[PDB]
C-alpha cells in the first residue's frame, strides 16, 4: 500500500452531516429542528 494510493475499507467512513448551510441540502433555515419544537 503506497502512501499516494490509500483507500479506506468500503463503508467504514461516512461524511459528517453539516447542518445549516443552505436550502439545497434539506437542513437549511430551520437546521433540521423544524419550527418551535
Amino acid at each position: 500500500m503506497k502512501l499516494h494510493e490509500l483507500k479506506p475499507s468500503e463503508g467504514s467512513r461516512k461524511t459528517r452531516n453539516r447542518v445549516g448551510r443552505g436550502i439545497g441540502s434539506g437542513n437549511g433555515k430551520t437546521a433540521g429542528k423544524g419550527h418551535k419544537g
Partner: protein, 201 residues
Amino acid sequence: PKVALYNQNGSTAGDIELNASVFGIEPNESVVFDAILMQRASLRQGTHKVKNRSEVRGGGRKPWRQKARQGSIRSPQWRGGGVVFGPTPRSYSYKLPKKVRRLAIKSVLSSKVIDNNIIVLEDLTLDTAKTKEMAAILKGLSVEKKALIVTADANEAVALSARNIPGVTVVEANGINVLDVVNHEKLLITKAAVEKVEEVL
C-alpha cells in the same frame, strides 16, 4: 520465502530463508490503512487555541446608555472579538488492539517482500564513519531512492554515516514500524536483524 543474500561489496551467490509466518503473510490492506491513519495521527501536537467570548479583554458593561443598554462589545458578531466554537487544545491519539498492530507490521513486511524491495545483507560494518563510504555502498547495491536500513543493536558507525544523505534513515531491530517501512521504497536489513524481528513476532 527465500531472498538472495547480499554483501556490502554488492555481490553474493548465497541465499537465506525468511520465516513465512512473517514474510509470507497475505497483506491485509484495511489493517494497514488504519495503522497508517493511527500512526500518522498521534504525531500531531494539537497546540491550538482560540479565545472565547468570555476570555476576551473587557465586555462586562452593556454598551449603549443614553444622554437603552444591550449586549457586550465582545459578542461573536462584533468586530472586537468572541469566537463561537473554534479550535481547542486536545489530543488526537488512540489505540488499536495489539493483534491488529502485529498483523499490520507483518502485512507491510510481506508486501515489501513481494515487490522485490527487500535486500538482506550479511552485515553492514564501517571501519570509518565517512558519508562518502555509505554513498559508495548504496550505489553498489543500486539504491537510488529513499531507503530504510535496519541493524541489529544500533552500531554507531552506520548511524553516523548516511545521517546526512537526504533520503536514508537508519533504525535498529525494535524500532521498525509501519510508516518508515511504507514510506521508504527499499529495505536494507542485516541477517541478524532478520532473526531478531522474526523472533520478536
